[PDB]
Amino acid sequence: QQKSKLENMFANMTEGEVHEVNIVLKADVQGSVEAISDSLLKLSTDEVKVKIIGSGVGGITETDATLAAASNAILVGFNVRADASARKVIEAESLDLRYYSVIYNLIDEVK
């Protein structure tokens, strides 16, 4: 964490690529979150940078919806269902809940 931040050796980016998109991901299976993220970092480009925040072990939760509340992001899951306490937060504030059966339909839309 310290290296990546200090690596730039400057207080900001040298050019205008500073604009980025944030995503929030929780997949039911542990095998996917590490595997597909690597493929999710392949679609990354210099112009627009995408990064994963708070990869989950499964489902959805209060602190996860809160995580997407602070910084604007899409909340996606390989396979997930909404909790009773989860629906209340998502329905109240403006957010987006989208679950995808396959990784291909996901890799296309993030792009």
């Binding site: 964490q1 995580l67 602070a70 910084s71």
Partner: peptide, 8 residues
């Protein structure tokens, strides 16, 4: 500190 942005 290393605290900023994310990481509750």
């Amino acid at each position: 500190h290393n605290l900023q942005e994310h990481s509750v």
